């Protein structure tokens, strides 16, 4: 986790080292409870000793409410009172061992122990490698959602104003300006953002600790013996639920202006003011503007730091901005001002579907409608480009929907008659829809996705609000007829027929389930929709979507969310996307299966019996296919226990590209830090390794008609 015994007030994350780790053991081995009872026993093994402290640190608070006291030279007892700072008092020595431990770092420590305790209690999956054999400290971006570098003025000494702010009183409190200035950034940044963030870290980049024998104090090239740092980097763990809130709520109005209101109005200054709402509450709040290129957090920190820290400070995070721009910008009203977390385009789509939903049901047909199920990408919030009215050049414009009727014994027993009978039902749905609702337009198209089933005809409805929907009919007899074909097929032809059945269930049966879970699972994972869209964009640039089915790109992209360990859940677009690339780089798909628990954050969780069954499946397939030529990616879940449903038919060359490109991208980030040039490389295709390359141009530009 990149935690050390070094000082943390300077800015580096640390303050909890081995001797903090050990002295917590010894303090716990002689007590630790509120009743001064032993929490750890001398007979415990290494596993139990480690588990106790991780549980002890995770749930008991040592900073705000509660502190622990022990006697080195007397049972350790947990006091309810807190000193508002991480404290482990030692009455024998009168020494607080967590003095170097900062408030902000402590919360990240408490979070890390808790999330490991959940993994430690986990019995379904082995977590040894994640707990101990996975370094999260390599990249700051992967650990921390947003990173902002602040360039302080006059950096061969800090400006007179900034030096003046240090003053004599704070030299007593904080011995070095680095200790004070780091504290100054945290308070204003923490107070300015408030609930928008979970954890904040301030790092003095380029700080040295060793200096030659000939010199009395450390010398920084920018510092000039004055300040031992090059620049300050502000790193955050954002809270997706309220990171994009337009207005920062504050204290309520009163006849006498309260102290919390006093600190409220002063901090944001002119940005502070008083507003009313529909509920009738009168509260001091400040209002920001949403943008499609940067989050609200960008504006708050820039204004907050400049007003309080230094008016000359330069605050910049371009890496966020490039990733935001790479996402296609829809051609709707106020698209630029729309946030990346806004699904307004998507809600408009299903409302139009709901209008059609009411129409189809009241319509009289020979067989009553069982249900109409939307199974589309925009219905699951994964379409690369957001839906746009009348933008029919978009590949995802015509959205598939499954129509099922009441079970009947009159369905044709032959495949072609069945499917032709389906078109007859759809042909009615077109007919009196045209008569009753003339504002809706319709036409028929053929589908060839299912091999050897050439009678499939789908009804395309052009909705008046400007959206296209594709309808295909589902019936119980359809599934068993495919099973009949496999049984009747010759032994040599059976592997071909089961492949046809595999694609059928991928569109009709498993497709319905995939939307139902992902659509519900998408909400609490607010940033999953942008990252999977940007992830899909990255595949398209490198000519990989043609072989990767849309659902596989979603299953690979959701892994950092459902399985964030050893990291946290992605809370920013770049952190999630780089996490997806990191996983693909280190994924050994020949010997390691991918299995996901498509569940909400802490039922439908995979149990031990289900877990071992899927593991048994992977071994059996790899026994027949060790090299993985036939199958490369084994992606499974409750929807797909077989694990081959959405990863079949991918050529081995392309499968290696996804890992090969992912590996080089990670290596590129290591060799050169995340910057504008690197990102532009990440999203441009080499196109040279291909044996022959053919260029094409369409007669007209399609960008405008694609809703971009």
């Amino acid at each position: 986790r990149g935690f050390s015994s070094n000082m943390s007030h300077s800015g580096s994350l640390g303050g909890f080292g081995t001797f903090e780790f050990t002295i917590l053991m010894a303090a716990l081995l002689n007590g630790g409870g509120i009743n001064s009872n032993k929490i750890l026993l001398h007979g415990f093994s290494s596993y139990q000793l480690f588990k106790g402290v991780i549980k002890y640190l995770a749930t008991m608070d040592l900073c705000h409410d509660g502190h622990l006291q022990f006697h080195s030279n007397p049972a350790s007892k947990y006091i309810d009172e807190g000193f508002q700072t991480p404290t482990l008092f030692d009455k024998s020595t009168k020494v607080n061992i967590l003095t170097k431990m900062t408030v902000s770092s402590y919360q990240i420590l408490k979070e890390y122990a808790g999330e490991t305790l959940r993994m430690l209690n986990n019995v379904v999956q082995d977590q040894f490698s994640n707990i101990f054999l996975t370094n999260i400290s390599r990249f700051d971006n992967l650990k921390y959602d947003l990173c902002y570098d602040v360039q302080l003025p006059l950096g061969n000494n800090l400006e007179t104003s900034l030096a003046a702010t240090f003053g004599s009183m704070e030299r007593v409190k904080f011995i070095t300006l680095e200790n004070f200035l780091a504290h100054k950034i945290t308070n204003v940044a923490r107070y300015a953002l408030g609930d928008r963030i979970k954890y904040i870290q301030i790092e003095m980049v380029g700080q040295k600790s060793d200096f030659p024998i000939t010199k009395r104090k450390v010398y920084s090239n920018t510092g000039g013996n004055h300040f031992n740092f090059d620049f300050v980097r502000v790193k955050l763990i954002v809270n997706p639920s309220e990171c994009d809130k337009l207005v920062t709520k504050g204290p309520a109005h009163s006849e006498t202006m309260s102290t919390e209101a006093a600190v409220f109005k002063n901090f944001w200054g002119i940005k502070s003011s008083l507003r009313r709402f529909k509920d009738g509450s009168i509260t001091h709040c400040c209002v920001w503007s949403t943008s499609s290129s940067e989050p609200i957090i960008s504006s708050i920190v820039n204004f907050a730091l400049q007003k309080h820290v230094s008016k000359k400070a330069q605050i910049s995070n371009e890496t966020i901005k490039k990733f935001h721009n790479f996402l296609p910008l829809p051609n709707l009203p106020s698209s630029a001002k729309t946030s990346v977390l806004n699904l307004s385009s998507f809600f408009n789509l299903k409302k139009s579907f709901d209008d059609l939903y009411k129409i189809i049901f009241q319509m009289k047909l020979p067989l009553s409608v069982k249900s109409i199920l939307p199974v589309g990408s925009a219905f699951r919030y994964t379409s690369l480009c957001q839906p746009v009215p009348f933008a029919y050049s978009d590949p995802d414009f015509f959205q598939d929907v499954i129509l099922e009727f009441e079970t009947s014994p009159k369905w044709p027993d032959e495949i072609t008659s069945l499917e032709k009978a389906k078109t007859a039902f759809l042909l009615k749905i077109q007919e009196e829809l045209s008569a009753n609702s003339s504002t809706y337009r319709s036409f028929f198209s053929r589908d060839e996705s299912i091999p050897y089933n050439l009678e499939i005809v789908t009804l395309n409805i052009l909705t008046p609000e400007g959206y296209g929907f594709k309808f295909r009919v589902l019936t119980e007899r359809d599934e068993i007829l495919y099973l009949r074909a496999i049984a009747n097929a010759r032994n040599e032809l059976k592997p071909e027929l089961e492949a046809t059945f595999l694609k059928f269930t991928a569109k009709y049966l498993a497709s319905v389930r995939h939307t139902r879970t992902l659509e519900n699972i998408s909400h609490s994972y607010q940033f999953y929709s942008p990252v999977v869209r940007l992830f899909k964009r990255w595949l398209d640039t490198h000519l990989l979507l043609g072989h990767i089915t849309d659902e596989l790109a979603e299953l690979i992209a959701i892994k950092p969310f459902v399985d964030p360990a050893p990291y946290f859940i992605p809370g920013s677009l770049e952190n999630g996307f780089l996490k997806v690339l990191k996983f693909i780089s280190q994924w050994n798909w020949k010997d390691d299966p991918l299995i996901l628990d498509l569940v909400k954050p802490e039922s439908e969780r995979l149990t031990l019996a289900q877990y071992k069954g899927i593991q048994m499946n992977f071994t059996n397939l790899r026994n027949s296919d060790p090299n993985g030529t036939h199958l490369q990616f084994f992606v499974a879940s409750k929807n797909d226990p077989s694990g081959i449903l959405y990863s079949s038919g991918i050529p081995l060359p392309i499968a290696t590209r996804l890992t090969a490109l992912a590996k080089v991208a990670v290596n590129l980030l290591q060799t050169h830090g995340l910057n504008q040039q690197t990102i532009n490389l990440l999203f441009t295709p080499g196109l040279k390794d291909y044996d022959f390359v053919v260029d094409l141009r369409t007669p007209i530009g399609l960008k405008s008609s694609c809703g971009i």
């Binding site: 093994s45 290494s46 596993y47 082995d126 040894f128 101990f132 054999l133």
Partner: peptide
């Protein structure tokens, strides 16, 4: 639990210092 316990042991021996350098220092 036995799988974890053996996994603990493998990690200790892999990272365990070579005693020769202890004598050297």
């Amino acid at each position: 639990s036995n799988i974890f316990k053996l996994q603990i042991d493998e990690l200790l021996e892999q990272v365990k210092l070579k005693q020769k350098h202890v004598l050297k220092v």
